[PDB]
Amino acid sequence: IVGGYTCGANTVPYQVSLNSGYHFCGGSLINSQWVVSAAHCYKSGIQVRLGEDNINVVEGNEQFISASKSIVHPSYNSNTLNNDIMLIKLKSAASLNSRVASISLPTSCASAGTQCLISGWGNTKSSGTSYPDVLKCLKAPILSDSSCKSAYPGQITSNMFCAGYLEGGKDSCQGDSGGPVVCSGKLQGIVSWGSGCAQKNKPGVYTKVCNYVSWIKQTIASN
């Protein structure tokens, strides 16, 4: 997250870190035994880390649970990142508390102008590299469909939306992938892609989760 702020320990209790010996991706806990992340975050050897603030320090409140099953969207296209969404089922159920809580799925899509909270342990630099150990937060608006497709001609599908600032200086970045975009207490976005970070007319591109709620619920229910 470039141009955000320190969330505060456990102020985003649905934010998970995906870990394969290191934090590599964000995720969103949607019930005690299921995480939503980006398909492009897919790999073997995933440990889900809940209750995390500093990902380099055990502060108490952490739950480390291995993934039992990963399900990449059937239609995930790694070339275009169309349908950039993946479910992860935990070996055992998260103990739910004030620091480890689920985020509700959308009952409908969000519109441009809605303010959202984007969070993650990703890069905080537009130029160069700096990785925070503590969770960063960004308030950013959903941008117009039209604004989004003009920034990335030919690359935005109905399964993608832009959030942020065409002026730049505020954006998701490398390491934030699979993380939450929450608007009005609903998981509307997954940190998917973009061109650079916090560059002018290059807003963050997010997986449009409201397109996936029927697939998420059917898959959870059958798995």
Ligand X SMILES: NC(N)=NC1=[SH]CC(CSCC/C(N)=N/S(N)(=O)=O)=N1
Decide whether 13 or 204 has the Cβ nearer to ligand X.
Answer: 204
Catalytic residue at 145? no
171 assigned to a ligand binding site: yes
CA 2 – CA 20 distance, rounded (Å): 24
In the complex, which residues of this chain contact ligand X (CB under 6 A)? 123, 171-174, 176-177, 191, 193-194, 196-197, 204
Residue 128 Cβ vs ligand X, minimum distance, rounded to whole Å: 8
Cβ 86 to Cl ion, closest distance in Å? 25
177 is a catalytic site residue: yes
Strand-pair partners of 49: 17, 64
| Residues 206, 84: Cα–Cα separation, whole Å | 8
- Picked from Ca ion, Cl ion, ligand X, none, the partner binding residue 7 (CB below 5 to 8 A depending on kind) is Cl ion
- Secondary structure tally for the chain: helices H, strands E: 2, 13
Residues ≥6 apart with Cβ < 8 Å to 153: none
Site string for Ca ion, 49-68 (x = CB under 5 A): ---x-x----x---------
Which residue's CB atom is positioned nearest to Cl ion? 137
Q: Is 52 annotated as belonging to a binding site?
A: yes
Give, in degrees to the nearest 5, the angle at Cα 177 between 173 and 183. 90
The three-class DSSP label of residue 10 is coil
Whole-angstrom CA distances from 26 to 14, 47, 149 are: 10, 12, 25
Has 73 been annotated as catalytic? no
List phi, psi (to 5°) of 151. -80, -35
Strand partners, 26: 17
Annotated catalytic residue, options 17, 23, 73, 84: 84
Among 2, 3, 4, 7, binds Cl ion (CB under 5 A): 7
Question: Which residue, 100 or 160, has its beta carbon nearer to ligand X?
Answer: 160
Residues contributing to the annotated binding site:
52, 54, 57, 62, 171-172, 174-175, 177
Binding site for Ca ion (CB under 5 A): 52, 54, 59
